[PDB]
Amino acid sequence: ITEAALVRDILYVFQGIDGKNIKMNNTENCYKVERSLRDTAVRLSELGWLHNKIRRYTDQRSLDRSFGLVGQSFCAALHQELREYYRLLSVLHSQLQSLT
């Protein structure tokens, strides 16, 4: 199967959204390809797995106004760092048109 589909899919699981030939078959496990190219994805999917935790956390605690001034200021920093990561991701999307 062609390389282009995996390259276009994998840049979306860093946000934490499954691709087309990349799906997450178990919650605890990181993102899985649906031979060597198939093996490559495990180190790259750790980033999406780690991203989900911070993103879920700054989702919940930011709109928690019984969580105090500190904690919402914590969320501000977490969200802004996730923003600068999306800045990187936007470039990486634009540099397509398959890229390894």
């Binding site: 600068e84 800045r87 990187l88 470039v91 634009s94 540099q95």
Partner: protein, 116 residues
């Protein structure tokens, strides 16, 4: 234009003088550029790309290192620059900061392990 009068234009650009005030610098230029004309080492644009990256990390600029990657995207979208490796390797060599080992960074392969 012929390449020799282009080297002449270059030596009239850096120096403020014309080629009626100096002929040693332009003869030195024809000495070094000639017999070492037209690249003979590795010429992929990816190799020079990872070294301007190396420079902008060392200057603690993460926005400019990703602005470059979109300037690097636009060169690939159009594709009108005939030697993308050379003019960026030139600009990388003339770099200076706005303000132990280093041979284990990326170096262009010499290609004397192959008859070219």
């Amino acid at each position: 234009k012929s390449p020799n009068v282009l080297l002449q234009n270059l030596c009239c650009r850096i120096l403020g003088r014309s080629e009626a005030d100096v002929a040693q610098q332009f003869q030195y230029a024809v000495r070094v550029i000639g017999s070492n004309f037209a690249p003979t080492v590795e010429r992929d644009e990816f190799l020079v790309a990872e070294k301007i990256k190396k420079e902008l990390i060392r200057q603690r600029r993460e926005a400019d290192a990703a602005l470059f990657s979109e300037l690097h995207r636009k060169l690939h979208s159009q594709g009108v620059l005939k030697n993308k490796w050379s003019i960026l390797y030139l600009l990388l060599s003339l770099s200076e900061d706005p303000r132990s080992y280093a041979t284990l960074f990326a170096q262009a392969l010499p290609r004397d392990a192959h008859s070219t």
